[PDB]
Design a binder for these strands. Structure first.
Ligand SMILES: [Mg+2]
Lengths: 80, 80, 178, 113
RNA sequence: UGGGCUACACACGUGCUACAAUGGACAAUACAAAGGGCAGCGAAACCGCGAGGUCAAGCAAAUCCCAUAAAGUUGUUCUCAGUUCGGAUUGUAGUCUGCAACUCGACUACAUGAAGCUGGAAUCGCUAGUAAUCGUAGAUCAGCAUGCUACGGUGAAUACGUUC
């Protein structure tokens, strides 16, 4: 959770999916409804199709993006 | 040089208080304080907060450490 | 002439060894240091140039030459013959004193100094430096100056190439951005 | 002059130090405490030795351009990573989730009716 | 399950906080009312700059806790400016609640330091414990109030009068 004492929050289903990909030499696109899950350092190099509420928007994790939730990068509202 | 068209110019000692660096060069600036020099004369002394040796760039000393990487800060923050 | 002494001794040796100069005469030297100030604001107010002139006179240690417009431009509201600048040419001992002070005191005093640009050479071995404010120079006091104004310092070198000039300035101890 | 900035001479040192970027009243109190320089004594009346001591402490804290550069870099990174916060920075709209229907003038600038 | 109701060139209504010296900051030092509480109110002690945490007494209530009211009073300092006014915005590191604070919480620390120099035309409330001002409590409620509904403290000016 937010508090330091609690570990960085990640959804188990998202985490387990990433874990399987770690072993694989070539990573595959991940469909995730987990906007709330934090981007871990392990997530680097993984592509996540985060749901924007109507469609899944592709997100590629990089070093800089770590420590930011996957949901942040996907946009739920459209203007102009 | 034409006489009386130029501002008064005289040798003055420039001192870096921080690094205790003294050098004698001419300046229009007049100082009440004067100090004995290597040369057998007394010259007015100008005090400088920062000099070549004082300024970090010249020395190449780094005052502060570089910012932690995003992966690094994540690991450090939650001790993982 | 502490900077001159360096040039006379260690610097001469470094340059001649580096570029395999056949004669001592070949070794580069700084012909002149010229400080340029532009006062287009003088068009708007006569006082501004006069104030700048005072500042330049103190920093340089010699009276500046007022520079007048060659041609009239409507956009700049410029009229030919109007006073729009002040220049000083420092040569001989005065030059060496100015340069040593600039590198030793004034350039350090520059705010958030990251070194001088390495690319600021005309391609003919002559370097130009632009100071953002004249407050960096020690003589000027912050109270005395009403408005901060930049200055250009032009180092003209006998060096044929910039590289030779760069080595001369580096041996002089000029900060380089790298 | 401390940290490349000339603090007002007339004002008391404690307040004068706040003028330096990256220094606030809290730090200004702390830097004087470490310097062992009294807050009461005014900058104009400050002794030369005291001034040097203040400078040493101020140097230890990140101040002026170094802090400015860091802050800019963080904002640049957010814009680079295309973070929602970063996108709002690019839009020039409230970044921290303040409502934009009304108000939001400081971020949005003057009214264009 | 996730998003939206939290969109943002703008217009309007109702509010909140300022534009300082009848003030700002700091230190010391007083005087209320009306309410809430069982797995809830949580003292004290220790730890933290603080938000909090740790441990844990009492207390189903004229007993214990929320909870020290604040303005005030007396000193000290600043000295008429966009400031030692103001505190929007943004960066960073935290705390707490919750399965989960990305969209979209509250709070803290540090830094940053906007507009604002008392407001065009126009327009609102109030005849006394009222207005004005200063804090206090409660419902809803995991958390979340500048709103709402209650409470006291200090405490005015003026009303010739009925042409409009
Ligand atoms: Mg609604």
């Amino acid at each position: 959770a937010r508090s330091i004492k609690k570990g960085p929050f990640v959804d188990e289903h998202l985490m387990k999916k990433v874990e399987a990909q770690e072993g694989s030499e070539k990573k595959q696109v991940i469909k995730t409804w987990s906007r709330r899950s934090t981007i871990f350092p392990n997530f680097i190099g993984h592509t996540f199709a985060v749901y924007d509420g109507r469609k899944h928007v592709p997100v590629y994790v990089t070093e800089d993006m770590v420590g930011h939730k996957l949901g942040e990068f996907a946009p739920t509202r459209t203007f102009k | 040089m034409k006489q009386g068209i130029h501002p008064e110019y005289h040798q003055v000692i420039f001192l870096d208080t921080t690094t205790n660096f003294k050098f004698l060069s001419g300046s229009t600036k007049t100082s009440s304080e004067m100090m004995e020099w290597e040369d057998g004369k007394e010259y007015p002394v100008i005090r400088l907060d920062i000099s070549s040796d004082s300024h970090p760039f010249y020395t190449g000393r780094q005052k502060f450490a570089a910012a932690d990487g995003r992966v690094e800060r994540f690991n450090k923050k939650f001790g993982l | 002439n502490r900077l001159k002494e360096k040039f006379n001794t260690e610097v001469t040796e470094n340059l001649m060894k580096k570029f395999n100069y056949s004669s001592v005469m070949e070794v580069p030297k700084i012909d002149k240091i010229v400080v340029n100030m532009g006062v287009g604001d003088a068009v708007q107010n006569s006082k501004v140039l006069d104030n700048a002139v005072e500042e330049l006179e103190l920093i340089t240690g010699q009276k500046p030459l007022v520079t007048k417009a060659k041609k009239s431009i409507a956009t700049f509201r410029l009229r030919e013959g109007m006073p729009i600048g002040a220049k000083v040419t420092l040569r001989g001992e005065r030059m060496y004193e100015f340069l040593d002070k600039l590198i030793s005191v004034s350039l350090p005093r520059v705010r958030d100094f990251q070194g001088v640009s390495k690319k600021a050479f005309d391609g003919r071995g002559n370097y130009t430096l632009g100071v953002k404010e004249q407050l960096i120079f020690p003589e000027i006091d912050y109270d005395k100056v009403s408005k901060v104004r930049g200055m250009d310092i032009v180092i003209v070198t006998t060096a044929n190439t910039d590289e030779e000039a760069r080595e001369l300035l580096a041996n002089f101890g000029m900060p380089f951005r790298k | 002059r401390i940290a490349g900035v000339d603090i007002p001479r007339e004002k008391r040192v404690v307040i004068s130090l706040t003028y330096i970027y990256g220094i606030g009243t809290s730090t200004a109190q702390k830097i004087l405490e470490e310097a062992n320089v009294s807050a009461d004594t005014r900058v104009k009346d400050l002794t030369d030795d005291e001034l040097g001591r203040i400078r040493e402490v101020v140097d230890g804290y990140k101040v002026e351009g170094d802090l400015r550069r860091e802050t800019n870099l963080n904002i640049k990174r957010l814009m680079e990573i295309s973070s929602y916060r970063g996108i709002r920075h690019r839009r020039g709209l409230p970044v921290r989730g303040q409502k934009t229907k009304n108000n939001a003038r400081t971020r949005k600038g003057p009214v264009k009716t």
